Amino acid sequence: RAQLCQPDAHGVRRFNGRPCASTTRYVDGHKGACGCGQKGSDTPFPWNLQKHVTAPSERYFDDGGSNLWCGKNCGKCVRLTPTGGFVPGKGGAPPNHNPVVFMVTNACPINGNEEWCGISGKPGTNHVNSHGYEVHFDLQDQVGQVEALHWDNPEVTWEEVPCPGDLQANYQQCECHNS
Ligand SMILES: OC[C@H]1O[C@@H](O[C@H]2[C@H](O)[C@@H](O)[C@H](O)O[C@@H]2CO)[C@H](O)[C@@H](O)[C@@H]1O
Ligand SMILES: OC[C@H]1O[C@@H](O[C@H]2[C@H](O)[C@@H](O)[C@H](O)O[C@@H]2CO)[C@H](O)[C@@H](O)[C@@H]1O
Incomplete structure (x- = not known):
């Protein structure tokens, strides 16, 4: 039992009342969505x-939509604890559980990312990926900032x-600010 978030009655993995x-x-070096x-x-x-930035799965990125440019949740921040x-064989247990805040600056599209980002509804609709999670966060690691957390695909x-x-100040120079 490497995944510690138990699926609820609707299949959504949760932990101590909180969604996982x-x-x-x-x-990938791209500017991003x-x-x-x-x-x-x-x-x-x-x-x-360089910073703690993320590409969430598509349906969260665009709050149920399919837009891959200026999604509704661009510029939102998420605290991940x-x-x-972890998913057995696809991650490991991290050295500590310090929480980290990431800003949404890109999208993880369903297309080409079935296993993790193939989620056919936004959080709240009980749609999950192949591992039972309602949302997925792909974490930018260009400069080793995820390695520096020693996060190997943690739950x-x-x-x-x-x-x-x-x-917030960084996001003000993104083109999608006030789109
Ligand atoms: O890079 C600008 C370009 O981003 C597109 O989003 C891509 C993103 O570049 C890539 O890093 C990520 O893996 O996939 C997303 C979505 O396919 C965006 O869709 C374009 O409109 C934009 O011009
Ligand atoms: O599709 C999402 C994301 O996956 C990344 O690869 C994962 C891989 O699926 C998993 O089996 C392995 O354990 O971890 C790697 C790294 O997190 C891939 O690097 C990304 O490009 C991709 O966007």
Whole structure:
């Protein structure tokens, strides 16, 4: 039993009353789906390669929609707290459970990401990925910021939170701000 969030009656994995999410890490160098780089380029701002930023699964990214540019949840922040769980063979238990806040700056589309991001409804609709989570957070790791957490695809509980001031200021230069 490596996954510590138990599926509820509707199949949604939860932990101590809180919804769980799966996580992965990614690198791709793109500006991303929230326009966090200079307009018209595919060049991210350095902070969007360096900071705690995420590409959530598509249906959360766009609050039930399929838009992959300026999704409704661009610029939102989520606090992710490890449970100690992970998907067997696809992660491991992290050294600590310190929570980390990530800002949504990109999208993990269903297309090409079935296992983790193939979720056919937004959180609250009891649709889950292949591992039983209502949402997935793909974590930017360009500069090893996820390695520095020693997170190997940890299971987490997730919540939306106000963004820290530095991340809020960063987001103000993304093209999707006030879209
Ligand atoms: O599709 C989401 C995301 O997956 C990343 O690969 C995972 C892989 O699926 C998993 O089996 C392994 O244990 O962990 C890696 C890294 O988290 C992939 O690197 C991403 O490009 C992709 O967006
Ligand atoms: O990079 C700008 C470009 O981002 C597109 O989103 C991609 C993103 O680049 C990539 O990092 C991620 O893996 O997949 C998403 C969605 O496919 C966005 O859709 C474009 O409109 C935008 O021009």
